[PDB]
Design a protein around this ligand. Structure first.
Ligand SMILES: CC(=O)N[C@@H]1[C@@H](O)[C@H](O)[C@@H](CO)O[C@H]1O
Ligand SMILES: *[C@@H]1O[C@H](CO)[C@@H](O)[C@H](O)[C@H]1NC(C)=O
Ligand SMILES: *[C@@H]1O[C@H](CO)[C@@H](O)[C@H](O)[C@H]1NC(C)=O
Ligand SMILES: *[C@@H]1O[C@H](CO)[C@@H](O)[C@H](O)[C@H]1NC(C)=O
Ligand SMILES: *[C@@H]1O[C@H](CO)[C@@H](O)[C@H](O)[C@H]1NC(C)=O
Lengths: 107, 307, 89
């Protein structure tokens, strides 16, 4: 159901410069529908969907340096299409909670 | 609620960031849930969690400096159904005495870690059905004999996929009720010994997708209902329908396989009992069905069974 | 704005008889996906650039019953959004 593309803000951490920069981009968030099976047959199926990217593209961005460090480039994924489906573990870290999109070690 | 280091809410405690160098000894013994996240924690000490009779869940995730889990670390926690160990890149050693009796364990997750060996599970003895989910641990190369016995008196689901497993010894699953076994995405895995499924009940579902496994075992699959072997390229023959008596569903690699299945019927023993009553499906155990559902179906022109 | 009902106890169409229904957790829970922050990448031996946080509608408690002629089913007494076990590849 309600899983939709929504603007978010992310944190690109520049470790050598002890700061992070914020960037708006587009990702997935919302609500999906699950059941918890009452009959536990080994041949189920037990399947649960979550809200994640159906398609994504990478974008590249200039990250300021500080005195004594060059500026650099960081490339990050951006979501084109969102849906309620399986979390794809080749590409994605499938967890309960991460540190959150805007997490920065310096603030 | 509140605490010295860890954030707290409703007897759920979260110890975060780098100021956490060890597990606080002043943690309430009425804690429902403990989470250690982003800690500079080099070790998790012996009996560290022993003695929380209220403890349902333990999350240890994203700890870069964590190298060891001591003995008897998960013990005397009668209410623990869920342990989650995620993203510890420097953790190479889990003490074989770390996992003690945990009668209520449902879910043990070890994913994205350094560990070089499966965890030792023979002292867990859970009363519940257990999902053992061990994934994205590249340094795990082999599965010993009896690697899963005593994990649970109840049947077991074993996901060992996306590891570095190249070696599976005979009787690796002995003394175990196997509902489901997923070995997929271990790319260097060439051979299942003929005695893998010795002293094991099931599997009922087996996934060997994206492995170099050359051949399936001749016995131990009398209970196999669902076989998933996608992009399993040097698996060329396969057991005859008479050997896979339970199979209802196969998603395979070589279409000729699917034609072998569509062309050999099976099914009499009439059948029973009571599905009585009074583009896909939902619940139905009537044995309504059909020759094994198989894919890829040799749809795009072409015959089957060769000429 | 898509009206996804909250995860909550309800009535199993199979398994259920008049006067003896069986209750099953079902509904909607919050999940999301965002780029993996670098600090996390430091901790991963297998890089994943996308991070996904999810929760699923599951029985927080239940009672085992036998119905219909011998089917062992659980009769869910309570529901919450908790750890997803079966959402992966
Ligand atoms: C959803 C959202 O707030 N995106 C941010 C917003 O804070 C702001 O409009 C902009 C800076 O002007 O950066 C973008
Ligand atoms: C939010 O979505 C709207 C859709 O019109 C888009 O224009 C906007 O760029 C997104 N985020 C921001 C910060 O504008
Ligand atoms: C099979 O399992 C039983 C009980 O756990 C064990 O005693 C026996 O030694 C196992 N067989 C082998 C070959 O290890
Ligand atoms: C399930 O429990 C509900 C409420 O506790 C009760 O109404 C119902 O009879 C139970 N169902 C069965 C089949 O025991
Ligand atoms: C993951 O991001 C890193 C950049 O940090 C990049 O090297 C890698 O190609 C990215 N995406 C994929 C699909 O590999």
């Amino acid at each position: 159901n309600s899983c939709e593309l929504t603007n978010i803000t992310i944190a690109i951490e520049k470790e050598e410069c002890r700061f992070c920069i914020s960037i708006n981009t587009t990702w997935c968030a919302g609500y999906c529908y699950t059941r918890d099976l009452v009959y536990k047959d080994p041949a189920r199926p037990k399947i649960q969907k979550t809200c994640t990217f159906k398609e994504l593209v990478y974008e590249t961005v200039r990250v300021p340096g500080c005195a004594h460090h060059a500026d650099s480039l960081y490339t990050y994924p951006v979501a084109t299409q969102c849906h309620c489906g399986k979390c794809d573990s080749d590409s994605t870290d499938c967890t309960v909670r991460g540190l959150g999109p805007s997490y920065c070690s310096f603030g | 609620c509140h605490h010295r280091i860890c954030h707290c809410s409703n007897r759920v405690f979260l110890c975060q960031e780098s100021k956490v160098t060890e597990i606080p000894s002043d943690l309430p013994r009425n804690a429902i849930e403990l989470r250690f996240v982003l800690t500079k924690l080099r070790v998790i000490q012996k009996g560290a969690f022993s003695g929380f009779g209220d403890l349902e869940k333990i999350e240890i995730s994203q700890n870069d400096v964590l190298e060891v889990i001591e003995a008897d670390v998960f013990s005397n926690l009668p209410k623990l159904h869920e342990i989650r160990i995620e993203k510890a890149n420097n953790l190479l050693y889990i003490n074989p005495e770390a996992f003690q009796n945990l009668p209520n364990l449902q879910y043990l997750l070890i994913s994205n870690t350094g560990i070089k060996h499966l965890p030792d599970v023979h002292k867990i003895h859970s009363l519940q059905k257990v999902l053992l989910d061990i994934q994205d641990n590249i340094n795990i190369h082999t599965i010993e004999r009896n690697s899963f016995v005593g994990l649970s008196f109840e049947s077991v689901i074993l996901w060992l996929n996306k590891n570095g497993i190249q070696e599976i010894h005979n009787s690796a699953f002995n003394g175990t009720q196997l509902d489901e076994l997923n070995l997929s995405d271990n790319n260097n895995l060439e051979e299942l010994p003929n005695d893998v499924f010795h002293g094991a009940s099931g599997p009922v579902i087996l996934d060997i997708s994206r492995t170099r496994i050359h051949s399936l075992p001749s016995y131990g699959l009398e209970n196999l209902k669902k076989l998933r072997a996608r992009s399993t390229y040097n698996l060329k023959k396969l057991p005859t329908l008479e050997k896979l008596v339970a199979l209802m569903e196969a998603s395979l690699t070589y279409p000729s396989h699917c034609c072998a299945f569509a062309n050999w019927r099976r099914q009499i023993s009439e059948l029973h009992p009571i599905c009585n009553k009074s583009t896909e499906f939902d619940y139905d155990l009537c044995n309504e069905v059909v020759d094994v559902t198989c894919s890829p179906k040799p749809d795009a022109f072409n015959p089957c069974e060769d000429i | 704005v898509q009206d996804c009902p909250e995860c909550t106890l309800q009535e199993n169409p199979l398994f259920s008889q008049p006067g003896a229904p069986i209750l099953q957790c079902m509904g909607c829970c919050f999940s999301r996906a965002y780029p993996t922050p670098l600090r996390s990448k430091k901790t991963m031996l297998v890089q994943k650039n996308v991070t996904s946080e999810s929760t699923c509608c599951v029985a927080k408690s239940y009672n085992r019953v036998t119905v219909m002629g011998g089917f062992k089913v659980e009769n869910h007494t309570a529901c919450h959004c908790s750890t997803c076990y079966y959402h992966k590849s």
